[PDB]
Curated annotation (Swiss-Prot):
UniProt membrane topology term: Peripheral membrane protein
Span within the parent record: 28 to 193 of 352
Known tissue expression: Expressed by the liver and secreted in plasma. Occurs in many physiological fluids including plasma, urine, and cerebrospinal fluid. Expressed in epidermal keratinocytes, in dermis and epidermal-dermal junction (at protein level). Expressed in red blood cells (at protein level). Expressed in placenta.
Places the protein is found: Secreted; Endoplasmic reticulum; Cytoplasm, Cytosol; Cell membrane
Functional summary from the UniProt entry: Antioxidant and tissue repair protein with reductase, heme-binding and radical-scavenging activities. Removes and protects against harmful oxidants and repairs macromolecules in intravascular and extravascular spaces and in intracellular compartments. Intravascularly, plays a regulatory role in red cell homeostasis by preventing heme- and reactive oxygen species-induced cell damage. Binds and degrades free heme to protect fetal and adult red blood cells from hemolysis.
Protein name: Alpha-1-microglobulin
Complex and partners: Monomer. Homodimer. In plasma, it occurs as a monomer or dimer and in covalently-linked complexes with immunoglobulin A (IgA), ALB/albumin and F2/prothrombin. Chromophore-bound alpha-1-microglobulin interacts with the constant region of immunoglobulin A. Chromophore-bound alpha-1-microglobulin interacts with ALB with molar ratio 2:1 and 1:1; this interaction does not prevent fatty acid binding to ALB. Interacts with F2/prothrombin (via N-terminus) with molar ratio 2:1 and 1:1; this interaction does not prevent the activation of prothrombin to thrombin. (Microbial infection) Interacts with hepatitis E virus/HEV protein ORF3.
Residues noted as binding 3-hydroxy-L-kynurenine in the record, renumbered to the chain: 26, 84, 110, 122
PTM entry text: Proteolytically cleaved in the presence of oxyhemoglobin or MPO. The cleaved form t-alpha-1-microglobulin lacks the C-terminal tetrapeptide LIPR and is released from IgA-alpha-1-microglobulin complex as well as from free alpha-1-microglobulin when exposed to oxyhemoglobin or erythrocyte membranes. The cleavage of IgA-alpha-1-microglobulin complex is associated with the reduction of the covalent bond between IgA and alpha-1-microglobulin, yielding an intact IgA molecule. The cleavage by MPO is associated with the transfer of heme group from MPO to t-alpha-1-microglobulin. 3-hydroxykynurenine, an oxidized tryptophan metabolite that is common in biological fluids, reacts with Cys-26, Lys-84, Lys-110, and Lys-122 to form heterogeneous polycyclic chromophores including hydroxanthommatin. The reaction by alpha-1-microglobulin is autocatalytic; the human protein forms chromophore even when expressed in insect and bacterial cells. The chromophore can react with accessible cysteines forming non-reducible thioether cross-links with other molecules of alpha-1-microglobulin or with other proteins such as Ig alpha-1 chain C region 'Cys-352'.
Domain of life of the native organism: Eukaryota
Stated consequence of mutating residue 26 to S: Impairs the reductase activity toward cytochrome c independently of the electron donnor. Decreases the reductase activity toward methemoglobin. Decreases the reductase activity toward oxidized collagen
Disulfide bond annotation, renumbered to this chain: 64-161
Protein backbone atom coordinates (compact mmCIF):
# COMPACT_ATOMS: atom_id res chain seq x y z
CA UNK A 1 0.00 0.00 0.00
CA UNK A 2 2.87 2.45 -0.72
CA UNK A 3 1.44 5.95 -0.37
CA UNK A 4 2.59 9.06 -2.26
CA UNK A 5 2.38 12.09 0.03
CA UNK A 6 -0.72 14.20 -0.56
CA UNK A 7 -0.50 17.65 -2.15
CA UNK A 8 3.10 16.91 -3.12
CA UNK A 9 4.95 19.94 -4.48
CA UNK A 10 7.90 18.60 -6.46
CA UNK A 11 9.33 22.09 -7.01
CA UNK A 12 9.85 22.28 -3.24
CA UNK A 13 11.80 19.03 -3.04
CA UNK A 14 14.76 20.32 -5.04
CA UNK A 15 18.10 21.35 -3.61
CA UNK A 16 20.44 19.71 -1.14
CA UNK A 17 19.60 16.89 1.29
CA UNK A 18 21.65 14.72 3.66
CA UNK A 19 20.95 11.00 3.98
CA UNK A 20 20.79 10.31 7.70
CA UNK A 21 19.21 6.87 7.88
CA UNK A 22 18.46 3.91 5.64
CA UNK A 23 16.80 0.52 5.76
CA UNK A 24 16.36 -2.17 3.15
CA UNK A 25 15.28 -5.68 2.27
CA UNK A 26 17.97 -5.83 -0.46
CA UNK A 27 20.43 -8.56 0.70
CA UNK A 28 23.48 -6.67 -0.59
CA UNK A 29 22.41 -3.36 0.91
CA UNK A 30 21.79 -5.24 4.15
CA UNK A 31 25.43 -6.28 4.10
CA UNK A 32 26.94 -2.84 3.40
CA UNK A 33 24.57 -0.39 5.10
CA UNK A 34 26.73 -0.16 8.23
CA UNK A 35 29.60 1.28 6.18
CA UNK A 36 27.50 4.14 4.89
CA UNK A 37 28.10 7.58 6.37
CA UNK A 38 25.94 10.68 5.92
CA UNK A 39 25.97 11.38 2.20
CA UNK A 40 24.74 14.36 0.25
CA UNK A 41 22.05 14.30 -2.43
CA UNK A 42 21.23 17.19 -4.76
CA UNK A 43 18.03 17.16 -6.82
CA UNK A 44 17.74 19.47 -9.80
CA UNK A 45 16.20 19.89 -13.23
CA UNK A 46 17.07 17.08 -15.62
CA UNK A 47 18.12 16.99 -19.28
CA UNK A 48 14.48 17.51 -20.16
CA UNK A 49 11.67 19.07 -18.15
CA UNK A 50 10.31 15.59 -17.40
CA UNK A 51 13.56 14.39 -15.82
CA UNK A 52 15.04 15.01 -12.40
CA UNK A 53 18.80 15.12 -12.04
CA UNK A 54 19.98 13.17 -8.96
CA UNK A 55 23.54 13.60 -7.66
CA UNK A 56 24.81 11.70 -4.59
CA UNK A 57 28.19 12.22 -2.96
CA UNK A 58 29.72 10.06 -0.25
CA UNK A 59 32.97 8.79 1.15
CA UNK A 60 33.70 5.29 -0.08
CA UNK A 61 37.02 3.64 0.70
CA UNK A 62 39.61 6.39 0.36
CA UNK A 63 37.70 8.84 -1.80
CA UNK A 64 34.76 11.18 -2.48
CA UNK A 65 32.52 9.15 -4.78
CA UNK A 66 29.85 10.82 -6.86
CA UNK A 67 26.96 8.84 -8.31
CA UNK A 68 24.71 10.58 -10.79
CA UNK A 69 21.42 9.48 -12.30
CA UNK A 70 18.42 10.78 -14.24
CA UNK A 71 15.02 9.92 -12.79
CA UNK A 72 11.84 10.21 -14.83
CA UNK A 73 8.68 11.84 -13.59
CA UNK A 74 5.67 9.56 -14.01
CA UNK A 75 1.88 9.81 -14.15
CA UNK A 76 2.00 10.52 -10.40
CA UNK A 77 3.59 13.44 -8.58
CA UNK A 78 5.94 12.13 -5.93
CA UNK A 79 6.65 8.91 -7.88
CA UNK A 80 9.81 8.74 -10.00
CA UNK A 81 11.20 6.06 -12.28
CA UNK A 82 14.84 5.07 -12.61
CA UNK A 83 15.41 2.47 -15.33
CA UNK A 84 18.79 0.79 -15.87
CA UNK A 85 18.33 -0.73 -19.29
CA UNK A 86 21.83 -2.26 -19.42
CA UNK A 87 20.94 -4.15 -16.26
CA UNK A 88 17.25 -4.87 -16.96
CA UNK A 89 16.60 -3.25 -13.58
CA UNK A 90 13.90 -0.75 -12.70
CA UNK A 91 13.72 1.28 -9.53
CA UNK A 92 10.65 3.28 -8.58
CA UNK A 93 10.85 5.85 -5.81
CA UNK A 94 8.09 7.39 -3.72
CA UNK A 95 8.15 10.53 -1.55
CA UNK A 96 6.00 9.16 1.26
CA UNK A 97 6.49 12.00 3.77
CA UNK A 98 8.20 15.42 3.57
CA UNK A 99 7.79 18.98 4.82
CA UNK A 100 10.24 20.21 2.19
CA UNK A 101 12.12 22.48 4.59
CA UNK A 102 13.43 19.96 7.05
CA UNK A 103 13.02 16.26 6.25
CA UNK A 104 11.97 13.77 3.57
CA UNK A 105 11.42 10.00 3.51
CA UNK A 106 11.79 8.21 0.17
CA UNK A 107 10.82 4.60 -0.48
CA UNK A 108 12.35 2.82 -3.47
CA UNK A 109 11.15 -0.49 -4.92
CA UNK A 110 13.64 -2.37 -7.08
CA UNK A 111 12.53 -4.83 -9.76
CA UNK A 112 14.96 -7.33 -11.25
CA UNK A 113 14.66 -10.31 -13.52
CA UNK A 114 16.73 -12.37 -11.09
CA UNK A 115 15.27 -11.70 -7.68
CA UNK A 116 11.97 -10.73 -6.03
CA UNK A 117 11.32 -7.01 -5.65
CA UNK A 118 13.19 -5.28 -2.87
CA UNK A 119 12.34 -2.16 -0.91
CA UNK A 120 14.70 0.47 0.45
CA UNK A 121 13.81 3.44 2.67
CA UNK A 122 15.94 6.56 3.10
CA UNK A 123 15.62 9.44 5.54
CA UNK A 124 16.92 12.84 4.46
CA UNK A 125 17.33 16.13 6.27
CA UNK A 126 18.04 19.63 4.98
CA UNK A 127 20.80 19.53 7.59
CA UNK A 128 23.05 16.62 8.68
CA UNK A 129 20.96 16.17 11.82
CA UNK A 130 17.29 16.08 12.80
CA UNK A 131 15.39 15.46 16.02
CA UNK A 132 15.26 11.91 17.42
CA UNK A 133 11.49 11.95 16.86
CA UNK A 134 12.05 12.04 13.10
CA UNK A 135 14.41 9.06 13.41
CA UNK A 136 11.55 7.30 15.17
CA UNK A 137 9.04 8.37 12.50
CA UNK A 138 11.40 6.94 9.91
CA UNK A 139 11.73 3.65 11.81
CA UNK A 140 7.99 3.08 11.89
CA UNK A 141 7.55 4.08 8.26
CA UNK A 142 10.26 1.62 7.20
CA UNK A 143 8.84 -1.17 9.37
CA UNK A 144 5.35 -0.47 8.02
CA UNK A 145 6.51 -1.28 4.51
CA UNK A 146 8.14 -4.55 5.54
CA UNK A 147 11.70 -3.65 6.53
CA UNK A 148 12.72 -5.50 9.68
CA UNK A 149 13.91 -3.41 12.60
CA UNK A 150 17.29 -5.13 12.37
CA UNK A 151 17.73 -3.85 8.81
CA UNK A 152 17.53 -0.14 9.68
CA UNK A 153 20.69 1.94 10.25
CA UNK A 154 21.32 5.51 11.44
CA UNK A 155 24.36 6.87 9.70
CA UNK A 156 27.41 8.54 11.21
CA UNK A 157 28.22 12.04 9.90
CA UNK A 158 31.80 12.26 8.58
CA UNK A 159 31.00 14.92 7.10
CA UNK A 160 30.70 16.16 3.49
CA UNK A 161 33.05 15.89 0.50
CA UNK A 162 33.21 17.85 -2.75
CA UNK A 163 34.35 16.16 -5.97
CA UNK A 164 37.36 17.98 -7.42
CA UNK A 165 38.58 19.12 -4.01
CA UNK A 166 42.40 19.43 -4.18
Amino acid sequence: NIQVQENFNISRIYGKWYNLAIGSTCPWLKKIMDRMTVSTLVLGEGATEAEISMTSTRWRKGVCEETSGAYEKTDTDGKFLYHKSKWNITMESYVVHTNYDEYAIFLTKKFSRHHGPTITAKLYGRAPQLRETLLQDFRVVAQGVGIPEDSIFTMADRGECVPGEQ
